[PDB]
Curated annotation (Swiss-Prot), chain B:
This is Geranylgeranylglyceryl phosphate synthase. The keyword Cytoplasm applies. Sn-glycerol 1-phosphate binds at Y171, L172, E173, A174, G175, S176, G177, G202, G203, G224, T225. Keywords: Cytoplasm, Lipid biosynthesis, Lipid metabolism, Magnesium, Metal-binding, Phospholipid biosynthesis, Phospholipid metabolism, Transferase. One of its GO terms (molecular function) is magnesium ion binding. Homotetramer. Homohexamer. Its EC number is 2.5.1.41. HAMAP family: GGGP_HepGP_synthase (MF_00112). Mg(2+) binds at D24, S53. It comes from Methanothermobacter thermautotrophicus (strain ATCC 29096 / DSM 1053 / JCM 10044 / NBRC 100330 / Delta H) (Methanobacterium thermoautotrophicum). One of its GO terms (cellular component) is cytoplasm. Pathway: Membrane lipid metabolism; glycerophospholipid metabolism.
Amino acid sequence: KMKVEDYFHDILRERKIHLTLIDPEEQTPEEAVEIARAAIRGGTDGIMLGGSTTDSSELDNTARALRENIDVPIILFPGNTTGVSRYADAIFFMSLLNSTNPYWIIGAQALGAATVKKMGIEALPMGYLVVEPGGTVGAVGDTKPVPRNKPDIAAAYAMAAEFLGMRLFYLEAGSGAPEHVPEEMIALVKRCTDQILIVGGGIRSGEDAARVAGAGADVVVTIREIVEGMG
Amino acid sequence: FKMKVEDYFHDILRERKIHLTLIDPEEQTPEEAVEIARAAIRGGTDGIMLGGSTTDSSELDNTARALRENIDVPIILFPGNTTGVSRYADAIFFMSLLNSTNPYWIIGAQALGAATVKKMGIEALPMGYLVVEPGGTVGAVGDTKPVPRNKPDIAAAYAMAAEFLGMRLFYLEAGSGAPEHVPEEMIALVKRCTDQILIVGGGIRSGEDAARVAGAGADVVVTGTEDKIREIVEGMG
Amino acid sequence: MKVEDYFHDILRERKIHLTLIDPEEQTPEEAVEIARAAIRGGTDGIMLGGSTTDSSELDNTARALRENIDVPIILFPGNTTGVSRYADAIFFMSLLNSTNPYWIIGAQALGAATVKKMGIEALPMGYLVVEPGGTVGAVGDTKPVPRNKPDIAAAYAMAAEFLGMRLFYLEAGSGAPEHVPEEMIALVKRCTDQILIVGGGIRSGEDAARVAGAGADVVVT
Amino acid sequence: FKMKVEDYFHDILRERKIHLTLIDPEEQTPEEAVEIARAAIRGGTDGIMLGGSTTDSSELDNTARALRENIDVPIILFPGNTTGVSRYADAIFFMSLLNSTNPYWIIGAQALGAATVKKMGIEALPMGYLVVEPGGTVGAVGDTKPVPRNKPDIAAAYAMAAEFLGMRLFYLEAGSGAPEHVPEEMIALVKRCTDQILIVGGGIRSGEDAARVAGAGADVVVTG
Amino acid sequence: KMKVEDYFHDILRERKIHLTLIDPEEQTPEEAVEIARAAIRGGTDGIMLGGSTTDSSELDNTARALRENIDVPIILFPGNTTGVSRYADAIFFMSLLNSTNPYWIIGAQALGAATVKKMGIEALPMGYLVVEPGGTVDTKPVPRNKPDIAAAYAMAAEFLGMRLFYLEAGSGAPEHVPEEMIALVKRCTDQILIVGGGIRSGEDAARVAGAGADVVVTGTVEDKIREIVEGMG
Amino acid sequence: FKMKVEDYFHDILRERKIHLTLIDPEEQTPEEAVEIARAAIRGGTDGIMLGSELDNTARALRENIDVPIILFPGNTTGVSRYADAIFFMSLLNSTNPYWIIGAQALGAATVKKMGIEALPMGYLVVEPGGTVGTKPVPRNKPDIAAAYAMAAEFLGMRLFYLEAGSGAPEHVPEEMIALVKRCTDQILIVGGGIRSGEDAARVAGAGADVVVTGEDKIREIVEGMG
C-alpha cells in the first residue's frame, strides 16, 4: 500500500503513465476484476474507480473485488461523496474549477471531509477542468466547458490551481468524446505549470494516446495499442 | 524579506506565534504609511499586509515601493481584487473565499490574476479563506454565506477540504469591525482538524482580545489601528 | 403495508411520531437499542441519515434495524449518500428555499436511478427550512423562511402541492432554540392537503403539543 | 365544456395518442384565436394550449374568454410565467423548468402564482419541463442549461427525479420553431424509465415530423 | 395628461412628494378609487399601483377605474413583468440592485421591456435597493448600519443612468430606512430619492423626509395620509 | 484632450460615424501607444480606449493627441485619473451579478473621486464572445439582443455595446445590429471581429454608430465606413 504520488514520481523519470477507468455500475464486481487484469495485460499501471455518482455499496463491493486481486493502485474518482471507500489506495481530492456552482468547487468537498479523514485514503490535490465538448460531466455539474480554441484559459486555471496547492491537474474532455482535448492546450497547460498533467476522454486511437502523451500529458486515462502509443 | 515567507513563518512558530499588520493602502498616503509601518515594526510586528482595497492600485504599487525601500520585514499582498497585485510585495496570500456564493471568489478571480502573479517573482502562499458572522463588510461585498458562530463544524469541514486541496494556510475572518472577534471554540477546532497555519483576523482590539484568540490556538493574528501594537503582541505572550 | 398507506391509516391517533437516528453519531447496535427504546412507547417509525459524509455507517445501521424492529425505516437524505438496501421508504425531497438548484433538482436528478434500482417506496416531499435553519441552513444554501412570514411558507407549500409533492416538511433545524411557530404550521395546513411534517427544536411534550395542536400530521425528534 | 382533463387524456391514451396546439394570445385578436382553434378541432386536435410566452395577461384572459365559450375541448394554459393565469382555462400545466440554472424557474415562480392558481378553480397538472438542444428562445430566456441532443441519459434522470417528486407529466421541449425535434432516442428512453405521460413539442412541422415523435413513445405531441 | 417626471420636478421645487401605494390584489377596482380618492383629499400626489405578482386582468380594471376618476398620476411599481397596463401614466422601471440573482437585476426587464415600448408608457429609470429587514422581498438586504454599502449601489446606479433610487425597507417593516442611510445617499448622488416601507406615522414621514427623501411611499393604511403629508410638510 | 466625449460623439454623428482605436496598455509600454495612437489618428480615428501600465499609458496620450481617451474597463483596475471619460458599463447577459452591478458598485467611488465623465453603457456579449464569451446571445436570436438593448435603455443606459469578442471569426450579424439600432435611440457601439474595410462597412451599414477595432490600417477601416 505504498504511496501513489511517489509511485508517479517514480514512473515519470523514464516513461509515461496510463490508468484504466472503470465504473462500479457498468458490470458486476467480479467482471470488473477481469477487466482489471486485462488492463495490466496491456500494461496499465493503475485503475480508476468512480465512474459517476452511484450507490456506495457496489462501489465498495467493486473496490473489495479490486483490492485483493490487484496491486497496481486503485484510485477513487468521485462523481460525488458517494465515491469514497475504505478499499481504494488513494482518492483524487479535486475541484472542478470551470464549474458555475460552488458545491462542485468546494461544497461537495467540505461535506465529504470527515469521511476522507476518518478513513485512511491518500487525498491527492487536483484541479479538474472540463474541456469542450465535456460529455456527461459537461451538464451534470453545470460546467462551462473551456473551448478548444482557447488554450490559454486552461493555463490560467492551471496556474490558479497550482498557486492554491493543487499539485495535480486534469483536462477532461469527457468520457466518450469525438476527439481528445486539443493538443496545444495540453502543451500549454504543461508550459505554465509543474503539476502532474492528467488528460482524459475522447481517447481511443493508439495515436490518439500517442498525441495526447506526446503533447506533454503526463498521464493518459481511458489497451496494448495505446500503452504502446504512449512510448 | 529576501526569502520565502512561508519558511519565515515556521522559523517563528518554533518559539512563539506571529503578528501581521493590515495597512489598507487607500486610507493614507505612501510615506504616511511607512511611518505607520515602522511604528508597527517597533511595537512588534512581523509583517505588513497590503489589502482592504477594491479600488486604486497605482496608489498601492507606490505603497509597496515605500516599504521595500524602508523595511527589512515581509510585506504581503492581501488581494481584495485583481487590482491588488504589485511587484514590491515579498509575497501574496493566494487565497480562495471558500464560503462565497459566487465562484469568482473561489476560483474565477484567482484564474484571472494567476497569469499576472506568475510573471512576477511573488511568492504564492496557498490559503483557504473563510468568513464568519457577521462578516464585516466582507459579509456583503464578496457575496457570501458567512459561517455561523455557533456552527464550528462548518468551519472545520471547509478548513479540512481546503487542506486536502493543498491550501496549507487557513484564515478565519470575523470581519472589518465586528463587535466580538472569531469564536474561540471555533479557532481551536479547525486548528485540530487540519495541519495548516491557522490565521485569525477581525474584531481584535483590546490586549485581551489577541490573548484569547492567540490563546485558543491561532498561529497568527492581524490588527489595524499609536504604538498600540505591543498592547496587541503582549497577548500572544 | 405501504408506508404512506400506513401514515394515512392513522385516521384516529393522527399523530405519526418519528424518531430521527444518526448512523455516525453512534454504532449500528445500540441504535437498535435506542430504536427499541424509542419504539418502547411513543413512536411510529424510524428516520435515518441526517448527518452527511460516510455511507459505510449507513448500510450497517439500516441492515441491523430492519430485522429487529416492527415499524418502518424511513431514509432522510442529507445528501445522495443516505440511500440503503434495507429501508422501507424514502422522503424524496426538494430543498425548496435553496438558492442553489443542486438542492432542488440537482441531487434528486443525480440519485433518481438508485431509488429506481431499489424498489424503495419514494415519498414525494417538499423540504422547507424555517429560521434559524441550522446546519441544514448553511449546508444547503438555504434562504431560511423568517418566522414572521407565514405567507411565504404557505406559498411554497401550495406550490409543492401543485407539482405533486404530497408531503410537506417545515424544518426548523437540529438545534433550533424554538420550534416552528404554530401560525406557520396551521397556515400551511389550511392551504394544502399535504401530510404536514414539522421538526427541529421539539424536546418536550408541550413542545410536541404546540406543533401537533396547530395542524402538524407528523412530529419528528 | 368542462371536466378534469387528466381523466380526459387518459381516456384517449388507451385507444390512440393525442395532439395539442400551442396558441400565443399575443399574436392574434382574441377573436382570431377561436377560428384558429375551431379549425384545428375540425383537424385532429384533442385540445388547445394557450401561452408559450410571458406577457401582460389582459389578453390571455381575453382569449380564454372566447375559447371557453365556443369550443368543447380543454383549454390548458402553458405558462410562460406567473403572468399567464386566467380563470377561464380548463386546466394548467404547473411546470418546473428542471434544467434551469436559476431557482426562480424551478420553484421560485411557482411559489408566486400557486396562490393565484388555488384562488381560481383551475385543474393543475403537475409537470416536469425539460429544455433539450437547441432550445429555441426558451433555452436562454430562463437561462436553462439545455440537455444535449446526444445525452438522453441526462433527460431520463431528470424525468425519473421529476417522477419521484410526484410530477406526473414530463415535457420534452425542443423550442418553438427549432430545426430538429427532440431526438427519438431521448423520447423512448424517457418513456421506459418512468410512468409519466410524455409530452413532446418544438420544431416539428411535417406530418412525418409528428410520425417519428409519436412513434418513439410520446403520449401527446404539441405543434405550433 | 402630462409627464410624471416633469410633474415630479414641478413639486420638488417647494416641497417633497408623497405617493400612495395601493395594490389591486386586495380590493375591487371600485374600492381602490375610494381609497385613492381619499388619499387625494388627504394630500397624496400620486397613486402607485403594484406590489405583488398575480393575475394582471385585475391590474387593468384597477388602473382604468382609477384613470377616469382621479386626476393624479397612476404609477406602476412592478413585482415582475406582469405589472404593466395601458392605463398607467408611467412605470418605475426598476432594477433590484442587491438581488443575488440576475433575473431581478436585468433579466426580468429584458423579458418585460418590449411591452413598455409597445405602449407609450413613460419609463422612469430606478435603482431599487432592499435594506434589512426588507419585508418579504433573492435579496441580500443591506444591513441598516452599512450605508457605505448602500451608497455605492446608488452611485453605481447613477453612473449607469438610473435617475431614481428607492431605499426599500419593504412594506410592513417595523422600522423605516435609517436617516444616516438616507442622508448619505442624497449627498452622494443627484437621483430623485424615494423612501418607502415602514412609514406609518406622520412622525415616521417627517424623519424620513428631513433626512433627504424626495419621495415618501406609504401603503393603503383615512386621515392617516393627511397626517403623513403634514408630517413631511 | 478636452470637452465632454458624449457631446463630441453626438457631433460626429450629425456627419458620419465614429471609429475608436482600442489599445490594451498591458500589451505594450506607453511609448508605443502614442505611435499606435498617431498611427490611429493618421487613419481617420476619433478616439482611443484602454482596457499601472494602464495608468501610465493614458498619462502620455492626453499631452500628445486631440481626441478623447476613453476607459474600457473589465474589472476594477481599469480606472485612471488620466482619461477624458469612461465606459461605465454593465455586462448585461452575465450569469454572476458581479459583472452586472457588483463590480460597478465596488468601483463607483473611484469614478466619482476621479472627476472622469462617465458614460452609461449596456454591454452585451455575442456568440462566440472571445475570452469573455457570461451567456453569449446566439448569433441567430437577435430578439434577445434587442430585449437586452431596450431594457438597458429604460434603465438610462444611453450607450450600448454588442461585443463579438476580440479575435472572433466573424463580427456581429448585420441582422442584430440593425434590429438593436431600430429598437432603441441609444449610441450603438459594435466591436470584435472587425479587421477589414469590409468588416467595418457591414457593421457600419447595418446601423452601428461606433466601430471599435484593436500600420495606419485604420484608414482602410475608416474608408470602409464611408
